[PDB]
Symmetry: C3
Subunit: 180 residues, 3 copies
């Protein structure tokens, strides 16, 4: 069956991320300003927390390929490949659409550890692009998730933040060997 796993992803401005590479080369008439376009590439890596926001789990890491810019929607479509690292729990890998202005569903391409053999889809919700994102992994194919990953979930909103003890990576507020 499906097990839902909720994850908060936060850019805390402390990992030199993201790196925007303007390889699409598109320029705005009259100003010659860069215009986001197919081919711009964006390596990134943020921090992740559990749904209760009380536990630092690890990081995301991967690469987004910019596909198109929408002036009307004021944002961009990307094609993304990245992983979520949960310390000793293992990792989940995803592939698919990352849209700056709306929610999307990514493929869960697999994982390791407690996630070995996982499959299904994951909902990406932009809370406040690009600093705060919320995921619902609809995980299939694995054993029952540990209770630590299934605490009551904080409902997402732009003001949400990790607990101080999770931001500080203190005991009781980190995944085992959480990914740094």
């Amino acid at each position: 069956h499906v097990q839902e796993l909720f994850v908060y992803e936060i850019n805390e401005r402390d990992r030199g991320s993201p790196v925007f590479l303007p390889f699409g080369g598109k320029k705005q008439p009259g100003t010659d300003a860069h215009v986001n376009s197919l081919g711009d590439l964006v390596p990134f890596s943020n921090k992740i927390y559990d749904g209760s926001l009380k536990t630092r789990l690890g990081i995301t890491a991967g690469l987004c390929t910019l596909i198109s810019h929408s002036d009307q929607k004021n944002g961009d479509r990307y094609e993304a490949l990245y992983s979520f690292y949960f310390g000793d729990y293992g990792h989940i890998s995803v592939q698919g659409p990352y849209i700056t202005y709306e929610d999307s569903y990514l493929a869960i391409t697999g994982g390791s550890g407690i996630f070995a053999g996982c499959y299904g889809q994951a909902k990406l919700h932009q809370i406040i692009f690009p600093f705060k994102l919320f995921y619902t992994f609809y995980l299939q194919g694995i054993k029952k998730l540990p209770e630590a990953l299934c605490a009551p979930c904080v409902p997402p909103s732009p003001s949400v933040a990790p607990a101080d003890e999770a931001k500080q990576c203190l005991p009781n507020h980190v995944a085992p060997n959480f990914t740094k």
Copy 2:
């Protein structure tokens, strides 16, 4: 068990695709023309149509990494990561080889929507290098495909083309909220 899904991918020359990034840095001794080589990168996005060429479904989007060029075979091996978007039906993601001079089989790494939990392999058949391709997805793990995606298939040949009404994206010739 296995359901076959046929898809036509066409570069209609209207999306600024592909973007060839010559990062392998190689040139032809004695002419200085670019020589395709490991590390050239190619972001891309084309249109996709159903097997009957009567319906615009959405787009492909992703990134190819050039691996090697063969003078003998007159072509290149790429390692490809991309997705197929079918509007409200969802998406399929793939990973694996794109060889410019012969058919190959990609891994189906998963999907969303009606394709959530899918797996298997997809045959890539080049019809006309580089602008027309035909895929056979050998899909496992999902519900019976909607008959709209299973219309009788137009046989692949160099001259095939989307129906005018599909090319023009008229209502009745597009997937539900087809991906633009």
Copy 3:
């Protein structure tokens, strides 16, 4: 689960890796988020008697550790086994320690595969050893399941495998 052992060797003859210093950091280059590394190496079976094919893909550098003297990458690549098919993987490559990659699928005899693969560094940066814990596929051919050479720094392909001679190559091994 079916175990499949694979040796990956950079024999320095494929112009690989190609290091693209797009992270932009300097000390002299400093490895940093956003450096990109296209690569392709040769692969051999666990017995080191057979050339199977190649790996091919792209790594994104995520972070450099001064303390551990190494880097974390996020990797996307495939393993090509000639006519047997391919396996695709996604996940971490850490230059200074073992990791587990997702097996994202495959083709041929590996069509529909899933599970995880352990990446073990033999000697940095030229030799790696993989254990694929393959699920979802039929019994692997005996040729891919020969007694494995235990990993150690001094291992290397049989000379006849390095030379791609008859009896030491996969069917239409990937070049």
